[PDB]
Amino acid sequence: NHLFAPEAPVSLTIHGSDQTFPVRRVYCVGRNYAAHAREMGFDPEREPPFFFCKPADAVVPVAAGSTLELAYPSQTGNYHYEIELVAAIGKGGCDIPLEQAEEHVWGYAVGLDMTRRDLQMRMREMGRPWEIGKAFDRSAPIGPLYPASQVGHPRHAAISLQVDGEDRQRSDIDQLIWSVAETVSYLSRFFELRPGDLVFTGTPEGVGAVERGERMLGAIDGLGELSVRVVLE
Ligand SMILES: [Mn+2]
Secondary structure, eight states: SSSSSSOOOEEEEBTTTEEEOOOOOOEEEOOOOOHHHHHHHOTTTTTTTTEEEGGGGGEOOOOOTTOOOEEOOSOSOOOEEEEEEEEEESSOBBBHHHHHHHGGGGEEEEEEOEEEEEHHHHHHTTTOOOOOHHHHHTOOOEBBEEHHHHHHHOOEEEEEEEEETEEEEEEEEEBBSSSHHHHHHHHHHHHHTTTTTTOOOOOOOOOOOOOTTTEEEETOOOOOSEEEEEEEO
């Protein structure tokens, strides 16, 4: 008996299906590609990856063959793209063994961890929480969800981001420091994973600023493409 209608849950389109995947929590892995860790001035051999979150309602589903018109955000001069493999949780649990971890992943999609980099870097230098840099409005564009019933659990796949026809990021998901299986196991030590949860597994090297009017195209092998154009605030 709600006082007023809640926000409907953000629901991902599912490739080749009329059914949608309702989003619960949004987990993100930071510094999960050695080359990216190094370009940000960190040592991936002496410090491990780490976890942060975005609200479900920062997730913005983008249909295949469509372009998201994404408003440049408030309170930033330094707005970064980050292409990422997204794993969707179908089966929950705690302290999930590495050997069954990928069995908890219902599907995969192309995602962007859009970032107010100036704000994120200011919070990092002040030892403060990163939410103003990472957990902001429409900060997680994502493509259709591909079921592991279709695409299995890929350990190899090219991951790429182009801006205005220019390659900016090109790596392979097999470069993840914590693989999908490791990230699901380790996340499950700190939180009970549940169906609907998404994991943004981190971004390869080549992250950069994007300005209004510029167009981005991300792709992962087997997972199609993600088209986003940055427009006015
Ligand atoms: Mn990221």
